[PDB]
Ligand binder design. Sequence first.
Ligand code: BEF
Ligand code: BEF
Ligand SMILES: [Mg+2]
Ligand SMILES: [Mg+2]
Lengths: 132, 133
Amino acid sequence: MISIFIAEDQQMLLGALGSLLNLEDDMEVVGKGTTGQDAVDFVKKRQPDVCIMDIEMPGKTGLEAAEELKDTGCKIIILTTFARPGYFQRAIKAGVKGYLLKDSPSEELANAIRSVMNGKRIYAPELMEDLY
Amino acid sequence: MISIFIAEDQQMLLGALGSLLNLEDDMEVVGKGTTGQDAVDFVKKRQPDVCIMDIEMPGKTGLEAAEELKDTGCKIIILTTFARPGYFQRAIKAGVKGYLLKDSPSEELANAIRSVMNGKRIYAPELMEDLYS
Ligand code: BEF
Ligand code: BEF
Ligand SMILES: [Mg+2]
Ligand SMILES: [Mg+2]
């Protein structure tokens, strides 16, 4: 069973993502948060296998949270509206294992969690497609 | 069984919303769309009880779509990031039954669908605390 923490400031989306992932037999949402701090606190304390991280959240962004969790051993997958090369470069330098867009098909999220748990790096193809 | 069409351009969110609503025993997601036209086409043709409508979508907005569906008898609930007075007033003039924010708790969605089916007008308390001032 893969343990997942979800950090997403928009409650409707946070609740819907937890519901989308609890559909999976080999996955479990162990906690939900709305800020970068909620992610840092849970991940350092509860140590879930995976953290689904939104970027733009109040207080501390998901990129800032990812930097604070760089040496924790948790596999961070960024899930954001923003296809920004600066956000992506800061995310990869922080050691994130994935970077997905909120415009990626929903099925790609559970797939990315399994891939990342298998040591793979998952970046939405839509990113390169947006830039070029 | 309440039939619902969801129009949301962000696929991840569209898929997650359908999953959130298919959890309910008295509800059913009969279609999903990413544009305002997808909403107009499905609603006029398939006539679901309810349409969960995002505002900002490519091609045709959810408000432009809500206006085209004003006389269809489908109960439209707006679900958006935007607590914008102009969007709200255009939505209500189009005859939308609800206006929810993406910052409303996830439970507000299934509750609003049942309330709207019971002839009520549902506006997110978060929207009213911001705008009603
Ligand atoms: F607000 Be998250 F970066 F989509
Ligand atoms: F893009 Be929708 F108006 F949140
Ligand atoms: Mg956010
Ligand atoms: Mg949109």
